[PDB]
């Protein structure tokens with residue numbers, strides 16, 4: 001008898017728009033706009049707090065060390081931190097952005113989770129995602145591993161595995177391409193791993209990259225010791241990737257017996273839904289036809305990067321980003337879905353404009369971890385969301401986050417200091433110890 | 441007053457043909473043929489010994505730990521070494537080959553070298569190549585770094601840098617894409633970094649991959665502290681890459697004031713040669729027209745993956761692979777070049793069939809390191825080629841290397857043991873200590 005616990009990423013203070021993710025249309029379209037770090041973190045914390053107060057287990061995962069000077073050094077720039085910062089700013093300012101992204105905030109890509117009810121050894125397994133496709137994102141893995149081990153520290157209940165080798169052949173984007181269908185969270189579930197490409201397969205996107213490879217997905221399934229009979233691999237529809245769906249969570253989401261997805265989500269969709277129907281009792285596929293919502297509208301509103309939550313009476317709630325309400329067509333469809341006879345009996349909207357401008361909605365900011373009562377108790381209590389942490393995190397944000405930020409500001413030695421201090425204090429607040437590289 | 445010292449790779453015991461390198465036509469064409477590890481090693485040692493006896497400073501770099509079980513475990517396969525070996529063999533035998541390749545033998549891709557005469561701090565710099573394009577090759581970096589630090593141990597004379605981050609954006613293939621033109625080895629030289637692609641540049645191969653990126657090349661130049669006025673970056677002709685030239689040393693080679701290269705080697709070749717002529721005193725470009733030798737014949741014979749050595753009297757010798765003599769056209773051209781009035785006054789041919797079948801000729805098996813008398817003296821004496829080491833290495837090969845091997849054999853637990861013991865013995869022979877992962 002376990003519960004699904006949502007772990008959201010606390011937006012970092014270097015949050016900015018750099019258009020680093022080709023294939024992520026929001027990122028590319030918001031290229032150099034001014035960002036609001038303070039506001040970004042605030043928006044995220046409100047969603048966290050809201051869901052928490054609504055009775056949905058909520059926790060937080062802290063931001064990373066940014067700017068990340070170690071990697072700049074690795075790239076040949078030497079001297080003291082400030083000196084490297086200076087040199088890079090004047091010689092290769094584009095790298096500055098690459099090592100100063102608040103991207104780890106999208107914890108949906110942090111790792112892939114395997115609830116103890118689906119593993120061979122009966123433990124909760126978490127495999128860090130290499131995020132190799134995007135350089136700025138590939139830097140997250142090491143620190144993310146340190147953070148996950150600092151939060152899920154009971155090694156008798158949790159097994160954190162290191163990321164797969166950093167090569168395109170094993171591109172892994174984590175939970176964002178993962179799905180879990182079944183009855184109650186606590187019972188053994190059916191894991192659906194979605195991938196973009198595989199060796200020897202000519203079926204693959206031709207305009208935008210397929211960040212996830214089947215080879216990676218299969219390795220993670222092994223690493224997480226997922227029972228072979230509870231795993232299924234499906235290929236994302238290449239056509240929809242070429243339109244902006246860089247992660248499965250941008251065109252489909254699962255929860256309990258329901259798989260809410262667009263009609264053009266997968267290749268051989270009919271075979272997959274039939275397979276799920278036969279392998280998952282009570283399976284309900286809610287397909288949205290291109291007729292009611294175009295893939296284009298899907299990518300801009302992020303109706304599928306929503307959180308599908310279970311209410312105590314079995315009914316479900318759809319957590320959506322504000323742009324879903326601001327789009328007549330999609331909002332109209334969501335309400336039709338709401339009124340229709342199905343599990344979706346409530347719509348909840350949040351303003352996550354800062355995150356959405358970089359291609360991340362409600363789901364992208366959270367990592368679902370199904371935990372038993374005993375496992376829930378073994379999680380670092382300091383990261384569980386509640387009044388105390390909420391007020392503390394908001395005060396922390398007001399003390400260190402700026403209201404405005406631009407790539408140009410990333411060179412400011414002052415920003416570097418504020419960030420180091422902010423993280424130092426945060427590590428104490430969250431009882432993580434010296435988890436960041438700069439603290440060692 | 442320094443000398444160029446050639447460091448060759450001692451072929452490993454797991455040498456086999458797996459067709460793992462798309463873009464490397466030899467590798468692809470010899471896909472699953474049976475290999476002869478013992479012979480492979482012997483062929484290479486003969487070339488080493490011959491050049492050594494001819495008066496050309498020669499050294500050796502040992503093979504790596506193969507099969508590399510740690511990576512298989514990182515891929516989700518658990519249990520004892522033999523258990524992992526078994527599971528992988530039966531579940532994903534293709535991985536077995538990826539972690540059992542003797543690829544590190546091609547040390548021309550081991551790192552990028554910067555002789556003390558070209559560095560800002562006056563030291564010899566070596567930056568390990570990430571070899572990120574090919575998974576099987578990308579595994580080399582860590583051990584390669586350990587080996588280079590065990591050979592070039594005098595930290596006051598040598599600076600070994602770690603490989604660039606492992607992402608396509610920074611694909612680095614080392615010295616194979618490097619060149620150095622100037623007067624005497626000991627004088628400051630002009631380094632020419634050849635790359636296949638760069639961000640924002642539409643000019644790039646469309647069939648085969650461009651393993652080297654300008655971004656990487658620029659970073660290595662920084663890492664190696666190369667004087668800015670002694671550096672030039674040039675792009676490989678994308679058309680020639682799409683024909684099998686996956687490394688610059690498959691289409692061009694430099695030595696002293698000479699740059700021996702095919703006419704279609706670089707993009708904007710005329711401007712590059714004019715640039716070199718103006719910046720390098722006595723510069724001599726020896727261009728081979730498509731009319732005399734086709735790109736196709738260039739890739740099959742490897743006339744350009746030859747070693748261009750300087751004889752005591754300033755004249756030069758061309759070390760070529762057997763296939764250059766077995767090809768009427770190329771052989772005819774080499775002799776014409778030999779008879780023509782130029783530095784090339786001698787042709788030397790070696791049988792490197794085992795290495796050639798996987799796309800590597802004379803140059804691919806060696807890493808050129810220009811060292812001063814004092815730096816030469818600081819190199820681990822145990823790896824310098826001479827009668828003692830030659831006889832010892834041959835006996836070592838006779839004791840541990842098989843006469844035949846196939847991908848199927850890579851699962852043999854006996855192969856794994858032979859390899860571990862062979863390496864342990866070699867570490868002692870070469871006085872390298874516990875340099876391999878399995879020894880720690």
Ligand SMILES: N=C(N)NCCC[C@H](NC(=O)CCC(=O)O)C(=O)O
Nearest residue numbers: 017018019020021024027108176364
């Ligand atoms: N849907 C999920 N699970 N995650 C969305 C993350 C968006 C992120 N954008 C960025 O990293 C853009 C950064 C910039 O351009 O500033 C990405 O492309 O990986």
Ligand SMILES: N=C(N)NCCC[C@H](NC(=O)CCC(=O)O)C(=O)O
Nearest residue numbers: 457458459460461464467548616804
């Ligand atoms: N010219 C230089 N400097 N190096 C050539 C190395 C050949 C190597 N072959 C391989 O890795 C193929 C192994 C196989 O497929 O079994 C490569 O492709 O990178």
Ligand SMILES: [K+]
Nearest residue numbers: 338340342344
């Ligand atoms: K409903």
Ligand SMILES: [K+]
Nearest residue numbers: 778780782784
């Ligand atoms: K000649």
